[PDB]
Design an enzyme around this catalytic site. Structure first.
Site, short mmCIF file in Angstrom:
data_model
loop_
_atom_site.label_atom_id
_atom_site.label_comp_id
_atom_site.label_asym_id
_atom_site.label_seq_id
_atom_site.Cartn_x
_atom_site.Cartn_y
_atom_site.Cartn_z
N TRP A 81 0.81 -1.19 0.00
CA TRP A 81 0.00 0.00 0.00
C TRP A 81 0.84 1.24 0.00
O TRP A 81 0.33 2.28 -0.28
CB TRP A 81 -0.99 0.02 1.17
CG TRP A 81 -1.85 -1.20 1.24
CD1 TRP A 81 -1.67 -2.26 2.05
CD2 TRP A 81 -3.02 -1.49 0.45
NE1 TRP A 81 -2.65 -3.21 1.84
CE2 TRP A 81 -3.49 -2.76 0.85
CE3 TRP A 81 -3.70 -0.82 -0.56
CZ2 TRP A 81 -4.62 -3.35 0.30
CZ3 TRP A 81 -4.82 -1.41 -1.12
CH2 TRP A 81 -5.27 -2.66 -0.69
N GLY A 115 -6.95 5.43 1.90
CA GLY A 115 -5.80 5.79 2.71
C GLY A 115 -6.06 7.00 3.58
O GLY A 115 -5.30 7.98 3.55
N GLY A 116 -7.15 6.93 4.34
CA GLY A 116 -7.53 7.96 5.31
C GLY A 116 -7.29 9.43 4.97
O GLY A 116 -7.09 10.24 5.87
N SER A 197 -12.37 2.93 0.76
CA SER A 197 -12.07 3.60 2.03
C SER A 197 -12.23 5.13 1.88
O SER A 197 -13.31 5.59 1.55
CB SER A 197 -10.68 3.19 2.52
OG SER A 197 -10.58 3.25 3.92
N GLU A 324 -13.87 -5.99 7.89
CA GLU A 324 -13.26 -4.69 7.77
C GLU A 324 -12.29 -4.34 8.91
O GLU A 324 -11.26 -3.67 8.71
CB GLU A 324 -14.37 -3.65 7.70
CG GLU A 324 -15.27 -3.84 6.52
CD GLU A 324 -14.67 -3.25 5.29
OE1 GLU A 324 -13.58 -2.65 5.40
OE2 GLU A 324 -15.28 -3.38 4.21
N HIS A 435 -9.95 -5.51 5.21
CA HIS A 435 -10.23 -4.21 4.65
C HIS A 435 -9.34 -4.06 3.43
O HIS A 435 -8.20 -4.50 3.48
CB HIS A 435 -9.92 -3.12 5.67
CG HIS A 435 -10.07 -1.72 5.14
ND1 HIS A 435 -11.25 -1.26 4.60
CD2 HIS A 435 -9.20 -0.69 5.10
CE1 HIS A 435 -11.09 0.00 4.23
NE2 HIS A 435 -9.86 0.37 4.53
#
Ligand SMILES: *[C@@H]1O[C@H](CO[C@@H]2O[C@@H](C)[C@@H](O)[C@@H](O)[C@@H]2O)[C@@H](O[C@@H]2O[C@H](CO)[C@@H](O)[C@H](O)[C@H]2NC(C)=O)[C@H](O)[C@H]1NC(C)=O
Ligand SMILES: *[C@@H]1O[C@H](CO[C@@H]2O[C@@H](C)[C@@H](O)[C@@H](O)[C@@H]2O)[C@@H](O[C@@H]2O[C@H](CO)[C@@H](O)[C@H](O)[C@H]2NC(C)=O)[C@H](O)[C@H]1NC(C)=O
Ligand SMILES: *[C@@H]1O[C@H](CO[C@@H]2O[C@@H](C)[C@@H](O)[C@@H](O)[C@@H]2O)[C@@H](O[C@@H]2O[C@H](CO)[C@@H](O)[C@H](O)[C@H]2NC(C)=O)[C@H](O)[C@H]1NC(C)=O
Ligand SMILES: *[C@@H]1O[C@H](CO[C@@H]2O[C@@H](C)[C@@H](O)[C@@H](O)[C@@H]2O)[C@@H](O[C@@H]2O[C@H](CO)[C@@H](O)[C@H](O)[C@H]2NC(C)=O)[C@H](O)[C@H]1NC(C)=O
Ligand SMILES: *[C@@H]1O[C@H](CO)[C@@H](O)[C@H](O)[C@H]1NC(C)=O
Ligand SMILES: *[C@@H]1O[C@H](CO)[C@@H](O)[C@H](O)[C@H]1NC(C)=O
Ligand SMILES: *[C@@H]1O[C@H](CO)[C@@H](O)[C@H](O)[C@H]1NC(C)=O
Ligand SMILES: *[C@@H]1O[C@H](CO)[C@@H](O)[C@H](O)[C@H]1NC(C)=O
Ligand SMILES: *[C@@H]1O[C@H](CO)[C@@H](O)[C@H](O)[C@H]1NC(C)=O
Ligand SMILES: *[C@@H]1O[C@H](CO)[C@@H](O)[C@H](O)[C@H]1NC(C)=O
Ligand SMILES: *[C@@H]1O[C@H](CO)[C@@H](O)[C@H](O)[C@H]1NC(C)=O
Ligand SMILES: [Cl-]
Lengths: 526, 524, 174
Positions: A81, A115-116, A197, A324, A435
């Site tokens: 990621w 990625g928040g 996300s 998740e 997730h």
């Protein structure tokens, strides 16, 4: 060929790629805005002054500044990621994959990475549009948008740091597709956003932004929605955090604009470092700098807009994964390692709760304990419980509730519960259907023969790919040819959803009804 | 502890159950031993006995063969009779809870075993727990099976067929006339059975003779409309004659053939039973219920089709893997010992075993529909299991429920999918035929018994739901925040899954497959 | 069967045999059977199924079953109401007096011509003036169609329901 497209901004050279005995043209790294540097840091993305000449668009561009997850150096599971190109303040580029031969009027898919709002980049292997172009003959576009402070630093109403800059990036990317995709044979009139996300959350925000109304057609939301606890920041914290960041870099001031002047001069890395610290306590899920009610992109608190039907009317496809929550346990929950099968004690469960709900009243944490630990003797109980807690609270419930309220205003919505564990999954059995681990099946990675997903898995992906493709093209996520299960519309009454897996896909009702009552009705009150 | 039956007195026997007492009346005769001159006749009324009948041991099981594929194996042997086989076997049991209850809802059990085998005395049919826990009265009886119970010479009162069925019916009349004396409420009576037991239950719904002998019905893996459950008036005869030839009993005066056979030894009959058909299957029900124009007044599919049956609630259901249990009695490649992976060639072979008479085309369709793979070794093994499962049990089960609810009655359907962890057969046979019975009779409620906690709960839940269904016609568990069990409508076709994790509500059980079995296959 | 379904599995051809040759003794049985097979599979079913799925999206659709044999038909009786042999009635050829179609036939053509004409003009294939049969909309539920012939035109349901189930549901799978 040698293959040039004449964009309303200049020319761009693509590059042929082989895909399952076929050609797809890739245009990697096309700039869609004017690098947001020095004086432009923290501002809305700026128009692109037409370049002269040919742009060689043949390698992914720079990812945007961000921190890097280094819990598990060398581990694929976590590292897959991390950004795979140079971090840079200069990162507003986008990719296009048109199938070959150049199509006439292809439906376009736009990817938005998760990625928040803190991390992510379009260049990830799992976001590779080349397969979708090849197989379903659509155009796939993805873009990079500013994240963390650099993309969401908010000083409310202050045009210097107006907040939601990353969101505006995305939007400018949409305008771009609007003005140009036709040149690649894309049909600007049939455009479907999809993300995961924070990506999904962004997709959902676009449904609310009037600025975006007309820049796309449909929407897909994978594990995420604006109404998720982590997704929007109150105009209060937005400030507290902008100030905290200022203090933390000796940038405190009187003339607010000056604080931006100050910060406009620090080194990216100096900002990136302190980001982690602008809150009193944090969680594995802390989205420190995110979307806020800026009265521009968002014109009012979004739960109100959702509540009162103030959003694009159109079909939506929404869904989550079976587990998740697990992915996060390993970044702070006492007892959890990716290496031992992480059985934990009641005492540790309580401990885990403190980690994920720091500010929550002692009573509040008690309710959670009480609702989830009403056992059906079994060792893993508390382990799985804490998983679901995080799962249900951050993803599955707000996901479901969004779908519900959205369909109430008369639109078709479809819901999926993805419950298959990739057999190439680098994390341990116990983390289950994790997730973010459906993305690869959506982009059709298992379609690649020499790749070692199973036959079961190739089929599945082929099916999902089609359903998605179809949903994009016709607003209906059916697979009409291989005698499949019909995917029912999600009504607010019966609440049907389709399970996605390698065995049989089934139609079921009222996903996690018990738990979400708690998260939706009770918990916002503690 | 004595009860004054309209026939005579009977002494019970106290038993301890989960720190409680339940009174057991084992072995009460309900009819007059069907011997010599009575062999092959409808059960005869009981001439009141004088004195006290000590009803304190299970009675004689009825004549029948004994499964001996796996001597010493619990798995197969647990179903063999545990009392002396005898022509003299018309007795029944009652379990009243203690203290004697006022007006308890009564449950009557009917044992399965293809109308060929079985007996009420089996450990798995022990009513003592149900009496204890749900405070109901449980009755079970024995009825004649195999030729001795179902030998059919159509319309000939000497062998009028369905004798065993009439047995069962007389047992119902008995409860009707007597259960009140044990504090039973004759007005609230639920029949429940399994396999051929279930099928009997369903036949009772069609028999006018039984209309008024009970209230509600439960059908566990089985229904008259199953391929194995009713015999045409033609085979009924062919078989009665074949049996005659096989014992040198052939004749001119038909009644004489009965006279002949009335004189051979039970064992001599039991022996030839296996042989009255040209070829058989692990599922061959050689001597079963037939259209006798007495108990059954017309072919039952017609009666079911045109709403000619008791109107009342019904609870119906099946197990995840009805088929497997039979694979091991003849399917090439199948052992209870190896994990029985088989080849395409063997699958075809298996089909020949279970559908002997079926056209070459007919077997092809089956092959075709079930072997359309989703590479995986077990494919053909599981396929053949489902084939037998779906064809013999799951579809006719479903189809019955469907047609029955069409006439305006509440029906509930369950898909039992839990594998007892004390299951003597191998993993691959999965949730096997007849392996829910123990959870229904609440055996896992027994602490020192080594079912799991998961399993104790489950049984407790089922026991309640059943109990409730018997009492109020509604299989809900209202107290422990349970899943509501939706009525089975002919449109949406919802059923409840029963297992230790989460019970779910689902639709259209095996829709794909049963279309084939219900719409297509009867035509080949 | 081998001729019309060359590539089809041996099983596949068996199903066809089986579905269509379940006789109601009569000599022509197999002759007519093979006709219908080709009829139903290539034309009548896919025709019906199109109509069905199309009307599901909310549009008016009308369906006709043309069942009249031109009396000037050069092919033999047994081929019956043949493929392509309604065209002449649609273009109104029997309206030509010195042409030797029957009176029955002139009427019929006049009617069809009108219905078509009307359908073209107003999207409704009615013949409103000569006390005709109303031509019902084809709904996916009841599936009504109008028969066209010289005697009486009738309203009927579920054209070839039995057979098309086979062609539509089963056969694409063999
Ligand atoms: C807004 O921020 C204040 C200050 O945050 C602190 O200073 C920042 C620069 C950064 O270094 C943070 O890590 C610091 O916590 C918060 O006040 C602190 O937090 C709590 C008060 O609830 C307290 O325990 C700390 O001691 C406070 N820090 C100090 C030394 O003042 C406060 O949490 C935020 N305000 C709200 C209500 O959101
Ligand atoms: C499961 O593992 C965790 C994580 O510990 C790490 O990974 C393990 C494979 C092992 O190699 C550890 O030594 C590694 O540190 C264990 O968590 C630790 O537990 C003890 C207290 O019980 C503590 O001293 C450590 O600091 C803990 N680490 C953290 C930050 O949680 C855990 O104990 C293991 N649980 C079991 C019983 O399997
Ligand atoms: C009814 O029965 C006849 C006779 O059955 C045979 O004789 C019995 C006494 C018993 O011993 C059986 O095992 C025998 O099969 C059946 O005719 C036989 O079956 C088929 C005919 O389809 C043939 O292969 C056998 O050779 C026949 N037996 C002999 C030697 O005549 C017949 O199957 C039954 N009739 C129907 C149509 O149901
Ligand atoms: C699985 O086992 C079956 C059953 O065979 C019996 O049980 C086995 C554990 C083993 O001990 C056998 O020898 C026992 O006979 C096997 O079926 C037999 O296979 C061969 C032909 O391949 C044949 O000679 C026997 O007669 C078969 N028995 C019957 C009546 O089916 C089977 O081959 C085993 N399959 C595998 C590969 O595991
Ligand atoms: C752009 O790249 C391609 C690579 O093949 C090449 O043809 C062309 O010369 C390049 N133009 C430049 C140097 O910008
Ligand atoms: C592409 O398709 C749209 C229909 O959604 C159409 O309006 C547009 O003009 C088309 N452009 C062409 C002809 O490529
Ligand atoms: C349907 O399955 C066939 C294989 O039989 C395959 O060729 C085709 O791609 C599949 N279609 C979809 C949408 O999965
Ligand atoms: C019946 O059995 C009981 C056993 O305790 C006994 O009290 C009674 O004497 C018996 N009567 C007989 C001998 O029939
Ligand atoms: C038993 O209950 C029924 C109600 O179903 C009632 O009619 C009958 O008289 C009762 N007998 C008693 C009072 O025990
Ligand atoms: C409900 O569960 C409790 C244990 O908390 C138990 O005492 C009771 O028997 C249960 N009831 C049923 C019907 O299972
Ligand atoms: C109706 O019939 C009359 C003859 O009575 C004829 O003149 C007219 O053309 C007919 N109309 C139609 C539409 O057939
Ligand atoms: Cl789940």
């Amino acid at each position: 060929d040698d293959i040039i497209i004449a964009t309303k901004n200049g020319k761009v050279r693509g590059m042929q790629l082989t895909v399952f005995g076929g050609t797809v043209t890739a245009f990697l790294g096309i700039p869609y805005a004017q690098p947001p540097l020095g004086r432009l840091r923290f501002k809305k993305p700026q128009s692109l002054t037409k370049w002269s000449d040919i742009w060689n668009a043949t390698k992914y561009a720079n990812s945007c500044c961000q921190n890097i997850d280094q819990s598990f150096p060398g581990f694929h599971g976590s590292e897959m990621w991390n950004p795979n190109t140079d971090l840079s303040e200069d990162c507003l580029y986008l990719n296009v994959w048109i199938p070959a031969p150049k199509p006439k009027n292809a439906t376009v898919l736009i990817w938005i990475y998760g990625g928040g709002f803190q991390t992510g980049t379009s260049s990830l292997h799992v976001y590779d549009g080349k397969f979708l172009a090849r197989v379903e003959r659509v155009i796939v576009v993805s873009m990079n948008y500013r994240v963390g402070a650099l993309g969401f630093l908010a000083l409310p109403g202050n045009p210097e740091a107006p907040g939601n800059m990353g969101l505006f990036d995305q939007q400018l990317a949409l305008q771009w597709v609007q003005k140009n995709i036709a040149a690649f044979g894309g049909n600007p009139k049939s455009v479907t956003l999809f993300g995961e996300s924070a990506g999904a959350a962004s997709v959902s925000l676009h449904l609310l932004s009037p600025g975006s109304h007309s820049l796309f057609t449909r929407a897909i939301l994978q594990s995420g929605s604006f109404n998720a606890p982590w997704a929007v920041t109150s105009l209060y914290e937005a400030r507290n955090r902008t100030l905290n960041l200022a203090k933390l870099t000796g940038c405190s001031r009187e003339n607010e604009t000056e604080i931006i002047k100050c910060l406009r001069n620090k080194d990216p890395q100096e900002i990136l470092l302190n980001e982690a610290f602008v809150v009193p306590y944090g969680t594995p899920l802390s989205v420190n700098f995110g979307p806020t009610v800026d009265g521009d992109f968002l014109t009012d608190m979004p739960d109100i807009l959702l509540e009162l039907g103030q959003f694009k009317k159109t079909q939506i496809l929404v869904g989550v994964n079976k587990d998740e929550g697990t992915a996060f346990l390993v970044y702070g929950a006492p007892g959890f390692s990716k290496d031992n099968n992480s059985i934990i004690t009641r005492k540790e469960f309580q401990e885990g709760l403190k980690i994920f709900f720091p500010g929550v009243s002692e009573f509040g944490k008690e309710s959670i304990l009480f609702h989830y630990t009403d056992w059906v003797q079994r060792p893993e109980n508390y382990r799985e419980a804490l998983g679901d807690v995080v799962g249900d609270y951050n993803f599955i419930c707000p996901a479901l509730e969004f779908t519900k309220k959205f369909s109430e205003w008369g639109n078709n919505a479809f819901f999926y519960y993805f419950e298959h564990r990739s057999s190439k999954l680098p994390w341990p059995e116990w983390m289950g259907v994790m997730h973010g681990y459906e993305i690869e099946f959506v982009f059709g990675l298992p379609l690649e023969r020499r790749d070692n997903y199973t036959k079961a898995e190739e089929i599945l992906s082929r099916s999902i790919v089609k359903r998605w493709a179809n949903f994009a093209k016709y607003g209906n996520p059916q697979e009409t040819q291989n005698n499949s299960t019909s995917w029912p519309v999600f009504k607010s009454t019966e609440q049907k959803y389709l399970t996605l897996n390698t065995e049989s896909t089934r139609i079921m009702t009222k996903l996690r009804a018990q738990q979400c009552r708690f998260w939706t009705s009770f918990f916002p009150k503690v």
